[PDB]
Amino acid sequence: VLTQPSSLSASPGASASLTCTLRSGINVGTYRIYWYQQKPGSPPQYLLRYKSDSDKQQGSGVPSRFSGSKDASANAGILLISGLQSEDEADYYCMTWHSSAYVFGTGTKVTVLGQPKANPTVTLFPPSSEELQANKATLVCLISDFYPGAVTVAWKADGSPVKAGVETTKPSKQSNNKYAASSYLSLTPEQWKSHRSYSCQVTHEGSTVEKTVAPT
Amino acid sequence: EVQLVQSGGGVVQPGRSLRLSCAASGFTFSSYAMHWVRQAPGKGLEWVAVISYDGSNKYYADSVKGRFTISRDNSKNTLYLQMNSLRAEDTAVYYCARAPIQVMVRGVMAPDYWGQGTLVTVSSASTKGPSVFPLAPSTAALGCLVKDYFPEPVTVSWNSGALTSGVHTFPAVLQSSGLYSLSSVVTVPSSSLGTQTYICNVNHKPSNTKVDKKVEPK
Amino acid sequence: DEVSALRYRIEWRPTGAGEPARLDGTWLVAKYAGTADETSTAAREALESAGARVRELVVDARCGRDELAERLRSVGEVAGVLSLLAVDEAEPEEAPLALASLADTLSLVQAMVSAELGCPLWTVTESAVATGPFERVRNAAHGALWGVGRVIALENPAVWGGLVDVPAGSVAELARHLAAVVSGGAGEDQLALRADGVYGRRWVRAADDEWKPTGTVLVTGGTGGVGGQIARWLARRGAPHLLLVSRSGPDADGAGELVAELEALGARTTVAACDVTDRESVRELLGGIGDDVPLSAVFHAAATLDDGTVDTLTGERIERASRAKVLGARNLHELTRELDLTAFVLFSSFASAFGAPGLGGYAPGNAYLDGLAQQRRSDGLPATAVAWGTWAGSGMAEGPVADRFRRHGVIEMPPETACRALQNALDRAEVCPIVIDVRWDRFLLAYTAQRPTRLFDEIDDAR
Ligand SMILES: [Cl-]
C-alpha cells in the first residue's frame, strides 16, 4: 500500500527527499502521512505528519530541517531533510490510515555519504580459567568502530587456517555510525593446549590486522 | 516524563497464547488512544492495533484480526495485547505506543511516543539461561562472556550502572546449536587494574538469570 | 406528496428584450473613475443611439449617500440611471461582501430616493449568473447585488429598474440589447445577455444512489436553530461522529442538552467553540479530526446576525451581519478543497431566492452561498446551496414578521420533511435546490401587490 525506496544517500548539507508512494488507484491527496525515524537499538521517534498545506504538524522537539509535503505527480508523500547531518543516518518509515487500519511503508535507510574510513579495533580474548575448568574453551574476537561496515574474519592456528568451530556475526551499526562484529572460535581444552598460538585476522578494505593468543 | 513500561515477553509455543502489558505513567492515561506495533528483527514496522482513549473503539491489522484482542484498564493505567494462535510469523519486538491527547469525543491518530519494546519468540525450543565467564585484561580491555542462552535478549551493565564510558556490549552470535552468546567489554586505564574493581551485571529475564561476575587481572 | 411539492430551482429561459425602444430625457451612467471605460462607452453609444442624452456620473468608492444625493439634485430631470459599479471590478483581498459595488449600489439607491429623481436604476453585472452549468459564476459576491436588488424592488418599486448580467469583458451584448431592456417592453427585470440571446430568471418546479453520513460530519451553527435540527437528522441517519461548531460552542444555550439528545439518537458528538470567520481557528479545528473518522460532509448552517436594529441598509452592516455565513463558507471552501467530501451544503434562504420586504440584510449573504456552490461545481467540487423556506419548531422569533410570512403564504416546514427534501436533493446532486412550502394563491398577490413580476411565469399554480 505504501512504497518507500530501500536506501537513500546524500552528502552532508544536502536536501534528502524521502518518498512514500501509494498504490495507483488511490489518490495521495487525502491521506495524512506520519513520519518516523528509527536508529539502531532505539524505538521509533515521531517526526511530523503531512496531509496538505492546510493540515500538517511538526513533532514536538523535531528540528525544522525535517519537513513534509507531497508530489501529486508521483502520488507520493515526501519527507525532506534539509541540511543533512551525520546524526540523521537511520531508518525512516511513513505511516497512514487506510480502510480500517494503519499501515507503514516498507522503510528507507538513509546513509550520509563521504564519511571517512575507520579502521577496526580488534580485541582477542583467550579461554578463561573458569571456562577451561568447566571443560570448554572459547576464543573471542571483538571488532569495533570500523567503517564502512564490511569485514572478513579468518582464524589460524600455528600458521594454518582453521575452518571448524568458527562463528562470526554480520556487521551491525553502532550509535556512532561505525560498525561492530564479533567472531568466536570454540575448542576443546585439549585442542586449545595442542597448538602453539592462535590468531584472529581481520581484513577491512584490503588492510589485514591480526591478534594472537597462546595457551602458554 | 512520559513512560511506557512494557512486560510479558519471552518464548511461547506455536498455537498457544501470550498476554503483553504496558504500564503508563507521566500523563493522564485515559485521555490517549494507545497502539501496538511490531517489528520482526531486521525487518520493517508493522502496525498491529489501536484502542481509543475510552476503549469503545478498536481496530486491528488484517494479519492479526480474529487472533488478537487489544484492551485497556484505565483505572490501572495499563494497556494489554492478548495474542492467540501464535505462529512463527508473529515473532517480533512488540512496541506499546501512545497517540497524541484526545481532542474530540471520537477519533484516533498515529503514535507520538513509543515504548522500548518486548521481544516475543514463537518457538518449540526451550528457554535456557546463560553461563557467564570473566574476560581478564591482558588503556586495557576487559570483559564478560555470556554464552549459550535462548531466547534473546540479554542485558549487561558494569558496576550496577556506574561504569558507562567505554562500555561496548556486542550483538549476540547465533550458533548452529540454536543458542546465543555475546560479549561485553569495557576499556579502562591499566593503572587502576590493581585497585579498582570491575563487575559485569548480566540479566537474562526469560530464564530469571541474574549474575554478577567480578573480572580481575589473571 | 409533501416533499415533492416543496421543490423548486432557478432556471434561465429565452425571453424577449422588448420591442424597438426609443428613449427620451437624460440617462446617467454611474461608474468609478478608474474602471469600466470600454463598457461605459458602449453603454453611452447604445443609449444615445436610441435617442437619449447621456452623462457620466462618477461615483467615489464607498461614498457618502448625502453628498451623492446633493449632486443628484443639481443634474435636473433624469430619465434613468445605468450602474456599472460592478463592471470591471477589482477583486482585492478582503472578505467577499466588503465589495464596494454592493456598498455603493445601496448608497446610490438611497441618494436617488433622497433626491426625488423619480427614475429607475439599472445595474449591470459581469458573469454574475450562470444560464446553465456550462457557464461559470465569476465572482460569487456579485450575486449579492441581485439578492438585495430584488428586495429593493419590493420595498421601493420606482427606484429599481432591474438587473442585467453580461459576459465579463464583453460589450457586444450590452450594445445590442441595452436600449430595449431599459425601455422595459416585456416586464423583465432580471436578465442575462449572452452571445446567443436574452434570458430571464424563472422559478420552476423540480421533479439508486443514497447519500449517507460517514466519518465526521461538521455542522456550523450546530448548537441551535436549523443546525440543531440538522444535527438530529444526521444522528438518526447514523453519523459516526458529529462535530458541532458555534461561537459559544459548549457554552451555547441548550448545548449540553443537545449533546445528550444526539447521544441518545445514536451519534457520538463533539461541540467546539470556533469563530468560523477566523480561517486559522477553523484550520486548527479541522486538523484535530482523527484519521478513522475523516471529515466527509459539511453542513454550513451558521446564521446571519440580527441585532434588532432598523437603520438604513449599508454594505458595511451587511458585511458584518453576514460574515459567519459568508467568510465561514469561503474559509470552509478553501480548507476542505483537498478533502474527499461527499457533501458540502450551504444553508441559503428564500430571502435570496425571491426576496421580501425587510429581508434586504439577509439576501446578500445567502446569494453569495448560491454563487459559491455553483462556482465549486464548475471547478469539480461537491456543493449544494439549499434556499430554505421557513422551518417549524427549532428557531425563528414568533412575532409580526414570521406571522407575516405565513400570512403571505409561506408555511413553516416540519423539520422531518425539510430534511427529507435535502436527502432527495443530495441523492440527485442538485446544486441549488429550493425547498419551501408556498400557497401560491395567497403568495402571488402578496408578492405582486406593488410591482409585477415575470419570475413565476413558469409555475402552473401561479397562473
Ligand atoms: Cl527496511
PDB file of N, CA, C and O in Angstrom, chain C residues 323-353:
ATOM      1  N   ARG C 323     -20.979  37.841   8.152  1.00  0.00           N
ATOM      2  CA  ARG C 323     -19.603  37.355   7.979  1.00  0.00           C
ATOM      3  C   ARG C 323     -19.456  35.881   8.334  1.00  0.00           C
ATOM      4  O   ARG C 323     -18.735  35.146   7.643  1.00  0.00           O
ATOM      5  N   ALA C 324     -20.069  35.430   9.430  1.00  0.00           N
ATOM      6  CA  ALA C 324     -20.024  33.999   9.731  1.00  0.00           C
ATOM      7  C   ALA C 324     -20.552  33.178   8.554  1.00  0.00           C
ATOM      8  O   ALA C 324     -19.931  32.193   8.137  1.00  0.00           O
ATOM      9  N   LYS C 325     -21.704  33.572   8.007  1.00  0.00           N
ATOM     10  CA  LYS C 325     -22.240  32.882   6.836  1.00  0.00           C
ATOM     11  C   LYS C 325     -21.272  32.963   5.662  1.00  0.00           C
ATOM     12  O   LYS C 325     -20.911  31.941   5.071  1.00  0.00           O
ATOM     13  N   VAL C 326     -20.794  34.165   5.348  1.00  0.00           N
ATOM     14  CA  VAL C 326     -20.074  34.382   4.090  1.00  0.00           C
ATOM     15  C   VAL C 326     -18.609  33.979   4.219  1.00  0.00           C
ATOM     16  O   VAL C 326     -18.125  33.111   3.478  1.00  0.00           O
ATOM     17  N   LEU C 327     -17.880  34.626   5.143  1.00  0.00           N
ATOM     18  CA  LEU C 327     -16.482  34.277   5.376  1.00  0.00           C
ATOM     19  C   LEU C 327     -16.339  32.849   5.890  1.00  0.00           C
ATOM     20  O   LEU C 327     -15.327  32.188   5.625  1.00  0.00           O
ATOM     21  N   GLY C 328     -17.313  32.361   6.656  1.00  0.00           N
ATOM     22  CA  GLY C 328     -17.239  30.982   7.095  1.00  0.00           C
ATOM     23  C   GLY C 328     -17.323  30.026   5.922  1.00  0.00           C
ATOM     24  O   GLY C 328     -16.537  29.077   5.819  1.00  0.00           O
ATOM     25  N   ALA C 329     -18.252  30.291   5.004  1.00  0.00           N
ATOM     26  CA  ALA C 329     -18.368  29.495   3.781  1.00  0.00           C
ATOM     27  C   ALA C 329     -17.068  29.500   2.982  1.00  0.00           C
ATOM     28  O   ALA C 329     -16.629  28.456   2.493  1.00  0.00           O
ATOM     29  N   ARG C 330     -16.460  30.678   2.801  1.00  0.00           N
ATOM     30  CA  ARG C 330     -15.249  30.737   1.992  1.00  0.00           C
ATOM     31  C   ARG C 330     -14.091  30.064   2.707  1.00  0.00           C
ATOM     32  O   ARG C 330     -13.295  29.356   2.076  1.00  0.00           O
ATOM     33  N   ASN C 331     -13.991  30.255   4.025  1.00  0.00           N
ATOM     34  CA  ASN C 331     -12.962  29.555   4.781  1.00  0.00           C
ATOM     35  C   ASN C 331     -13.113  28.049   4.627  1.00  0.00           C
ATOM     36  O   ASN C 331     -12.140  27.341   4.336  1.00  0.00           O
ATOM     37  N   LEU C 332     -14.332  27.538   4.821  1.00  0.00           N
ATOM     38  CA  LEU C 332     -14.529  26.100   4.763  1.00  0.00           C
ATOM     39  C   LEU C 332     -14.260  25.596   3.359  1.00  0.00           C
ATOM     40  O   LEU C 332     -13.670  24.532   3.178  1.00  0.00           O
ATOM     41  N   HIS C 333     -14.671  26.369   2.354  1.00  0.00           N
ATOM     42  CA  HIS C 333     -14.348  26.021   0.977  1.00  0.00           C
ATOM     43  C   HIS C 333     -12.835  25.901   0.778  1.00  0.00           C
ATOM     44  O   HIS C 333     -12.343  24.876   0.290  1.00  0.00           O
ATOM     45  N   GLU C 334     -12.076  26.930   1.179  1.00  0.00           N
ATOM     46  CA  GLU C 334     -10.623  26.900   0.986  1.00  0.00           C
ATOM     47  C   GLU C 334      -9.974  25.746   1.740  1.00  0.00           C
ATOM     48  O   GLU C 334      -9.018  25.133   1.250  1.00  0.00           O
ATOM     49  N   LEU C 335     -10.479  25.425   2.928  1.00  0.00           N
ATOM     50  CA  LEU C 335      -9.787  24.478   3.784  1.00  0.00           C
ATOM     51  C   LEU C 335     -10.184  23.030   3.521  1.00  0.00           C
ATOM     52  O   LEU C 335      -9.437  22.127   3.886  1.00  0.00           O
ATOM     53  N   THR C 336     -11.326  22.780   2.898  1.00  0.00           N
ATOM     54  CA  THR C 336     -11.711  21.427   2.542  1.00  0.00           C
ATOM     55  C   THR C 336     -11.470  21.116   1.071  1.00  0.00           C
ATOM     56  O   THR C 336     -11.747  19.996   0.637  1.00  0.00           O
ATOM     57  N   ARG C 337     -10.951  22.074   0.306  1.00  0.00           N
ATOM     58  CA  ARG C 337     -10.692  21.926  -1.125  1.00  0.00           C
ATOM     59  C   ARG C 337     -10.049  20.589  -1.486  1.00  0.00           C
ATOM     60  O   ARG C 337     -10.310  20.053  -2.560  1.00  0.00           O
ATOM     61  N   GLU C 338      -9.207  20.040  -0.614  1.00  0.00           N
ATOM     62  CA  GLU C 338      -8.451  18.837  -0.928  1.00  0.00           C
ATOM     63  C   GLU C 338      -8.915  17.617  -0.143  1.00  0.00           C
ATOM     64  O   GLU C 338      -8.229  16.591  -0.154  1.00  0.00           O
ATOM     65  N   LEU C 339     -10.063  17.687   0.518  1.00  0.00           N
ATOM     66  CA  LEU C 339     -10.650  16.511   1.137  1.00  0.00           C
ATOM     67  C   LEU C 339     -11.641  15.868   0.171  1.00  0.00           C
ATOM     68  O   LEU C 339     -12.125  16.493  -0.766  1.00  0.00           O
ATOM     69  N   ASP C 340     -11.921  14.594   0.389  1.00  0.00           N
ATOM     70  CA  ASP C 340     -12.900  13.889  -0.438  1.00  0.00           C
ATOM     71  C   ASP C 340     -14.272  13.959   0.229  1.00  0.00           C
ATOM     72  O   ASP C 340     -14.794  12.980   0.760  1.00  0.00           O
ATOM     73  N   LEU C 341     -14.850  15.157   0.207  1.00  0.00           N
ATOM     74  CA  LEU C 341     -16.158  15.361   0.812  1.00  0.00           C
ATOM     75  C   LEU C 341     -17.246  14.736  -0.053  1.00  0.00           C
ATOM     76  O   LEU C 341     -17.218  14.839  -1.281  1.00  0.00           O
ATOM     77  N   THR C 342     -18.203  14.071   0.599  1.00  0.00           N
ATOM     78  CA  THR C 342     -19.401  13.617  -0.092  1.00  0.00           C
ATOM     79  C   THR C 342     -20.444  14.721  -0.235  1.00  0.00           C
ATOM     80  O   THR C 342     -21.280  14.652  -1.138  1.00  0.00           O
ATOM     81  N   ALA C 343     -20.448  15.711   0.654  1.00  0.00           N
ATOM     82  CA  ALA C 343     -21.417  16.795   0.583  1.00  0.00           C
ATOM     83  C   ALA C 343     -20.819  18.048   1.212  1.00  0.00           C
ATOM     84  O   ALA C 343     -20.116  17.986   2.225  1.00  0.00           O
ATOM     85  N   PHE C 344     -21.106  19.183   0.602  1.00  0.00           N
ATOM     86  CA  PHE C 344     -20.683  20.494   1.095  1.00  0.00           C
ATOM     87  C   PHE C 344     -21.939  21.347   0.911  1.00  0.00           C
ATOM     88  O   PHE C 344     -22.195  21.859  -0.181  1.00  0.00           O
ATOM     89  N   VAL C 345     -22.733  21.460   1.975  1.00  0.00           N
ATOM     90  CA  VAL C 345     -24.085  22.014   1.912  1.00  0.00           C
ATOM     91  C   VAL C 345     -24.097  23.398   2.540  1.00  0.00           C
ATOM     92  O   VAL C 345     -23.810  23.551   3.736  1.00  0.00           O
ATOM     93  N   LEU C 346     -24.476  24.397   1.764  1.00  0.00           N
ATOM     94  CA  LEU C 346     -24.588  25.749   2.268  1.00  0.00           C
ATOM     95  C   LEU C 346     -26.057  26.074   2.491  1.00  0.00           C
ATOM     96  O   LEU C 346     -26.902  25.773   1.642  1.00  0.00           O
ATOM     97  N   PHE C 347     -26.361  26.679   3.643  1.00  0.00           N
ATOM     98  CA  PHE C 347     -27.744  26.967   4.021  1.00  0.00           C
ATOM     99  C   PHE C 347     -28.056  28.375   3.550  1.00  0.00           C
ATOM    100  O   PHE C 347     -27.645  29.358   4.171  1.00  0.00           O
ATOM    101  N   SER C 348     -28.766  28.466   2.432  1.00  0.00           N
ATOM    102  CA  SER C 348     -29.219  29.723   1.868  1.00  0.00           C
ATOM    103  C   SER C 348     -30.700  29.900   2.226  1.00  0.00           C
ATOM    104  O   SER C 348     -31.229  29.189   3.092  1.00  0.00           O
ATOM    105  N   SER C 349     -31.391  30.819   1.549  1.00  0.00           N
ATOM    106  CA  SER C 349     -32.694  31.246   2.054  1.00  0.00           C
ATOM    107  C   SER C 349     -33.598  31.718   0.924  1.00  0.00           C
ATOM    108  O   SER C 349     -33.127  32.210  -0.103  1.00  0.00           O
ATOM    109  N   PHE C 350     -34.910  31.628   1.154  1.00  0.00           N
ATOM    110  CA  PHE C 350     -35.831  32.300   0.250  1.00  0.00           C
ATOM    111  C   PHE C 350     -35.558  33.796   0.171  1.00  0.00           C
ATOM    112  O   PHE C 350     -35.940  34.441  -0.818  1.00  0.00           O
ATOM    113  N   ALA C 351     -34.874  34.357   1.169  1.00  0.00           N
ATOM    114  CA  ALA C 351     -34.509  35.772   1.123  1.00  0.00           C
ATOM    115  C   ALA C 351     -33.715  36.111  -0.136  1.00  0.00           C
ATOM    116  O   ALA C 351     -33.876  37.202  -0.697  1.00  0.00           O
ATOM    117  N   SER C 352     -32.838  35.202  -0.593  1.00  0.00           N
ATOM    118  CA  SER C 352     -32.192  35.409  -1.886  1.00  0.00           C
ATOM    119  C   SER C 352     -32.920  34.747  -3.049  1.00  0.00           C
ATOM    120  O   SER C 352     -32.710  35.154  -4.195  1.00  0.00           O
ATOM    121  N   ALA C 353     -33.753  33.735  -2.811  1.00  0.00           N
ATOM    122  CA  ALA C 353     -34.375  33.077  -3.953  1.00  0.00           C
ATOM    123  C   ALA C 353     -35.423  33.981  -4.614  1.00  0.00           C
ATOM    124  O   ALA C 353     -35.457  34.093  -5.847  1.00  0.00           O
TER     125      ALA C 353
END
